[PDB]
Ligand binder design. Structure first.
Ligand code: SF4
Ligand SMILES: [S]
Ligand SMILES: [Zn+2]
Length: 422
């Protein structure tokens, strides 16, 4: 339908970024609680086109301030399913990034948004989030979406409340993923949704490796392909298995070559050290090699602090970004860290020597579960250094020594390291 924003809106603005100095509001990114959700609802419980804002609006908050956020998108459609919810929810990301002076990254309840001083000057107000979502949902998913309603929560209480509604739907999606492993499926999925940001980037999504945005599970990719054969996701048959440990299939290599416009020739699903997966612009975390540690550090998009690699998330994002292949450096989704297949060819989670404490917190129970499953002890999470120990190799290494971090005494990871050239 019709969309009449006071701000430009379209593909050309998607890659915009908004510096703190230009920011009018910010919500999410661990600065305030924030979530987004897409729900199948029945038709009698939905008003098509209705957008409400519950809580303070853009003109009722100091400039440069923070706000908690709940984006709730109720969909009704004759053909609509629960299985599809994760597919539409992903699109909230570019839908918003199309608006000039609107910025969004992350997923679920670690999403992050900013609105620019200019967008506000021009007229933007929270209602417009709703208008964009209503228009675009309808436009992109014609066969699936008959009716759309949007609620934008900015009241502290209501976000806390609807967070639970979301948490519940989230857990429910993850349950569908429980049974499925890489060995026990015969199809993987390619994703190219982000080639607007990196023209040659392709994600290869398997049941044990979520998309680097952490918002496209194997099931999501599958659902997407069923929703639209000409869509951003394609099926890749597992065939021509070259290396079971590294994770190289002749057929994955084949579809990767085509999808990356003859740019990438091989990818290894289970290693960081040779033909690793490339990155677009929305990865949640970056893994970087730490040669002196015989290990790997991780830092996250929303973590501003120094890291023992000597650079911050941004500076790291700088090198690994753009669909180029970078041995020793990889962009990943948060929950990948706790996959069984997490860099399994390099010794798995045992290699992680440093992480932001927030990440540890977010993944706590899984880390502990996986720890036990590889005989690293339940106390393994506490042997991984974080910023409260130090940000430099000089600080963290004696800690690793003292705590007896397993990485220190494994095989030289650096021998694993195949250059990208020749
Ligand atoms: S990060 Fe990867 S899986 Fe997620 S939307 Fe992008 S290309 Fe797809
Ligand atoms: S991206
Ligand atoms: Zn992306």
């Amino acid at each position: 339908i019709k969309l009449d924003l006071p701000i430009n809106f379209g593909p050309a603005f998607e890659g915009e970024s908004i510096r703190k100095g230009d920011m009018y509001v910010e919500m999410g990114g661990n600065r305030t609680p924030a979530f987004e959700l897409v729900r199948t609802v029945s038709e009698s419980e939905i008003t098509d086109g209705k957008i409400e804002v519950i809580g303070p609006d853009i003109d009722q908050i100091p400039e440069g301030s923070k706000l908690p956020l709940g984006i709730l998108v109720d969909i009704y459609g004759r053909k609509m399913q629960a299985d599809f919810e994760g597919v539409l929810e992903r699109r909230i990301h570019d839908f918003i990034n199309y608006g000039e002076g609107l910025w969004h990254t992350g997923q679920r309840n670690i999403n992050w948004l900013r609105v620019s001083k200019d967008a506000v000057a021009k007229g933007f107000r929270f209602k417009n989030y709703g208008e964009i979502l209503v228009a675009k949902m309808k436009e992109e998913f014609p066969a699936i979406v008959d009716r759309v309603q949007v609620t934008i929560f900015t009241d502290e209480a209501k976000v806390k409340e609807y967070m639970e509604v979301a948490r519940e739907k989230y857990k429910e999606r993850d349950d569908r993923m429980r049974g499925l492993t890489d060995e026990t499926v015969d199809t993987f999925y390619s994703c190219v949704l982000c080639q607007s940001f990196a023209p040659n980037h392709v994600c290869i999504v398997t049941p044990e490796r979520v998309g680097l945005c952490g918002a496209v599970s194997w099931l999501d990719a599958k659902a997407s392909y069923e929703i639209n054969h000409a869509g951003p996701n394609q099926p890749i048959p597992k065939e021509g298995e070259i290396d079971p440990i590294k994770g190289i299939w002749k057929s994955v290599n084949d579809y990767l070559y085509t999808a990356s416009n003859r740019n990438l020739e091989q990818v290894c699903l289970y290693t960081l050290m040779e033909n690793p997966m490339t990155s677009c612009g929305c990865f949640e975390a970056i893994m970087a090699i730490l040669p002196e540690c015989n290990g790997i550090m991780i830092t996250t998009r929303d973590h501003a602090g120094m890291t023992p690699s000597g650079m911050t998330f941004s500076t790291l994002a700088g090198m690994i970004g753009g669909g180029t292949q970078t041995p020793g450096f990889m962009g990943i989704g948060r929950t990948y860290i706790v996959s069984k297949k997490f860099i399994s060819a390099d010794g798995g989670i045992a290699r992680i020597v440093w992480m932001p404490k927030s990440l540890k917190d977010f993944l706590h129970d899984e880390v502990v579960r996986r720890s036990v499953e590889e005989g690293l002890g339940e106390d393994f999470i506490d042997k991984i250094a974080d910023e409260t120990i130090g940000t430099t190799v000089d600080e963290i290494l004696p800690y690793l020594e003292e705590k007896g971090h397993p990485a220190l005494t494994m095989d030289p990871i650096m021998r694993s390291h195949t250059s990208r050239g020749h």
